[PDB]
Design a protein around this ligand. Structure first.
Ligand SMILES: Cc1cn([C@H]2C[C@H](O)[C@@H](COP(=O)(O)OP(=O)(O)[C@H](F)P(=O)(O)O)O2)c(=O)[nH]c1=O
Ligand SMILES: [Mg+2]
Ligand code: NA
Ligand code: NA
Ligand code: NA
Length: 326
DNA sequence: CCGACAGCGCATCAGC
DNA sequence: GCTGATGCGC
DNA sequence: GTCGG
C-alpha cells in the first residue's frame, strides 16, 4: 500500500460516479486507475509520474497532484458534505440496493439505517436480508474461517453425491489472508454443454447445506446460480460467527477451466483479460473462449484443457491465481 | 476527434 | 403467462 | 475518464 491515499481517493471517486452520478464508465475508469496505481511499486510523487501509467489520464493526474499537495481533494470534501449524495452512497451499501433504489428511497425521505428498518415493508426480499445482515456483511472473513467453511461445503457436497466437485474461488483461491465472501464453483458429470441428465443439481446441494444449518438465507436462486447467506457453527458459550455472503455457481463440467478462471477473478483482472481477448480477436465468458470472426460474431467454442490454454490463445504468459489480484 | 469500454444469472417490471 | 428491458450483483 | 486508431 505505497499509494494507499491516492487509490482510496480514486475508489471514493469511483463509488460516487457509480452510486450518485450513475455514470458507470467513470466508475470503471476510476477503478482501473486505482488498480494500476495500487500495484505500481514506487511511491508516487507526481501526477505526471502517474500519468505514465495506462488508465491514468489528465483529469486523474490533476487530482493526484492536488491530493499530494494538500492531502485531500476539494471535490470529495464537497461530496462528503452533500446530504443527498452521502445518503445515496450509504444506502447502496445494503446488498440489493443499487443507485436507482437508493435515489428512490432518498426521494421518499428514507435515508438512514433506522428509516430502512422502519420501512422494511418497502424492500424486496434481497434488500430485506441485506438490511438484516448489514453489519455482518461489512466484516471480512479471515482465511482460517474460509478454511472451515471450505471443509463444511466440500464434505457436505460429497454426502449428496461423491461425483460433485466443489471449488472455492474468489480471493481465497488467489491466496488472500481474508475474503469478503465465499465463492463456490460446482461441477457434476451429469451437467455438461451437451445434456442436463439430472435436474435440481444445484437445489440438492443448497438443500443439504440448509439441512445442516450452514446456509441460513437465500438472496436469489436459479438452476445454475445460488446467492445467499451462511454461518459457521459456534461452540458452547461462544459468541456466534458473523453471517457470511455465499455464492454457488454450477457450471458445465467440460467448461470448468473457463468457469474457474471467471470465478477466481479478480473482477478487474477479468475485465482486463476479456478486453485483451477482444483485441486479439477472441471473446471469453465463464463458459467458453470463442474466436471473433470478420463481422464481430462469435464463432464456435475453442478446445480448453487448462486455464493456461485460455491464456495461450490470447498470447498472455500464464498468471498464477495469486498474481491476478488486480 | 470519438467509439468502445466484459459478460452474464436472477429478480422485477411493463406491455401484451 | 411470455418477452424484453432494467436493476443489481457476481 | 481514458484511449487507440
Ligand atoms: C464483481 C465481479 C466479480 N466477477 C468475478 C470475479 C470475482 O473474483 C468473482 C467473485 O466476485 P467477488 O465480488 O466475490 O470478488 P472476489 O474476487 O471474490 C474478492 F476479492 P472477495 O469476495 O474475496 O473479497 O466473480 C466478475 O467477473 N465481474 C464482476 O463484476
Ligand atoms: Mg468473493
Ligand atoms: Na496514462
Ligand atoms: Na447495494
Ligand atoms: Na461473491
Amino acid at each position: 500500500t505505497l499509494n494507499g491515499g491516492i487509490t482510496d481517493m480514486l475508489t471514493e471517486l469511483a463509488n460516487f460516479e457509480k452510486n450518485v452520478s450513475q455514470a458507470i464508465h467513470k466508475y470503471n475508469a476510476y477503478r482501473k486507475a486505482a488498480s494500476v496505481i495500487a500495484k505500481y511499486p514506487h511511491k508516487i510523487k507526481s501526477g505526471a509520474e502517474a500519468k505514465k501509467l495506462p488508465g491514468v489520464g489528465t483529469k486523474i493526474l490533476e487530482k493526484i497532484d492536488e491530493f499530494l499537495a494538500t492531502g485531500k481533494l476539494r471535490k470529495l470534501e464537497k461530496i462528503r458534505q452533500d446530504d443527498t449524495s452521502s445518503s445515496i452512497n450509504f444506502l447502496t451499501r445494503v446488498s440489493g440496493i443499487g443507485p436507482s433504489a437508493a435515489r428512490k428511497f432518498v426521494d421518499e425521505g428514507i435515508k438512514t439505517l433506522e428509516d430502512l428498518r422502519k420501512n422494511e415493508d418497502k424492500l424486496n426480499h434481497h434488500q430485506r436480508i441485506g438490511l438484516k445482515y448489514f453489519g455482518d456483511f461489512e466484516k471480512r472473513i479471515p482465511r482460517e474461517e474460509m478454511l472451515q467453511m471450505q471443509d463444511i461445503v466440500l464434505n457436505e457436497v460429497k454426502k449428496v453425491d461423491s461425483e460433485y466437485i466443489a471449488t472455492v474461488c474468489g480471493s481465497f483461491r488467489r491466496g488472500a489472508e481474508s475474503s469478503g465472501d465465499m465463492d463456490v464453483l460446482l461441477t457434476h458429470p451429469s451437467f455438461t454443454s451437451e445434456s442436463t441428465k439430472q435436474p435440481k443439481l444445484l437445489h440438492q446441494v443448497v438443500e443439504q447445506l440448509q439441512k445442516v444449518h450452514f446456509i441460513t438465507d437465500t438472496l436469489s436462486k436459479g438452476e445454475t446460480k445460488f446467492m445467499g447467506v451462511c454461518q459457521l457453527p459456534s461452540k458452547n458459550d461462544e459468541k456466534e460467527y458473523p453471517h457470511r455472503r455465499i455464492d454457488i455457481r454450477l457450471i458445465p463440467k467440460d467448461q470448468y477451466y473457463c468457469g474457474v478462471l471467471y470465478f477466481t477473478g479478480s473482477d478487474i483482472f477479468n475485465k482486463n483479460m476479456r478486453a485483451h481477448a477482444l483485441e486479439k480477436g477472441f471473446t471469453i465468458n465463464e463458459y467458453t473462449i470463442r474466436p471473433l470472426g470478420v463481422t464481430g460474431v462469435a464463432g464456435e467454442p475453442l478446445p480448453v484443457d487448462s486455464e493456461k490454454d485460455i491464456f495461450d490463445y490470447i498470447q498472455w504468459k500464464y498468471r498464477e491465481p495469486k498474481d491476478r489480484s488486480e
